[PDB]
């Protein structure tokens, strides 16, 4: 093609909807609005959370809980991912192949079966047991 025979992909573009332009279009007259009432007027909007005067659900259910402003959240890395990284080094925590300046926690999802030297901020008990069974090392910092 060139600039004189441009073509988009089939179904990529579509004409917009135009209302109030006659009977043949199927969208004239009342222009998809119905007949009367509040919803047919210019400038109508929905009051969000308004149910006609009944007590709304966000007011009749109770508030619960509190959030911790000093919350430590780790990033879950599993043993199967650790194996995948190990298969094309031994000393792990390279993190350049994945997080970006965060705390990491090793969890037990697959298996290791290979001697690693995994270093991470925190570990699971099953993770440490699996590393020991595979004949590896755990460094926690």
């Amino acid at each position: 093609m060139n600039l004189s025979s441009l073509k988009p992909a089939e179904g990529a573009v579509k004409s917009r909807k135009r209302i109030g332009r006659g009977p043949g279009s199927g969208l004239g007259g009342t222009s998809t609005r119905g007949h009367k009432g509040a919803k047919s007027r210019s400038g109508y909007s929905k009051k969000i959370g308004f149910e006609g005067g009944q007590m709304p659900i966000q007011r009749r259910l109770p508030k619960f809980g509190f959030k911790n402003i000093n919350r430590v959240e780790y990033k879950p890395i599993n043993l199967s991912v650790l194996q995948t990284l190990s298969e094309a080094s031994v000393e792990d925590l390279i993190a350049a192949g994945v997080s970006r300046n965060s705390l990491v926690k090793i969890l037990a999802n697959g298996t290791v079966t290979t001697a690693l030297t995994v270093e991470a901020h925190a570990f699971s008990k099953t993770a440490e047991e699996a590393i020991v069974r595979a004949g590896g090392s755990v460094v926690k910092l």
Binding site: I48, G49, Q58, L61, K63
Partner: protein, 64 residues
Amino acid sequence: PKLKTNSGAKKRFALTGTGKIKRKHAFKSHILTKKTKKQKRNLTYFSTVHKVDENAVKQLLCLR
């Protein structure tokens, strides 16, 4: 401008892993005694938002 979150909704609702909305149970009568000890149904277990009432809590929490 960006859509604003409803403050009461953000204090009353939470999201789960599958995208379901969980909530606390309001009592029928909040004066315990003269109500059967089976009030653990509304006193111990978090429930979910009914599918019919859904999309309203979503719009309250900015369709999240």
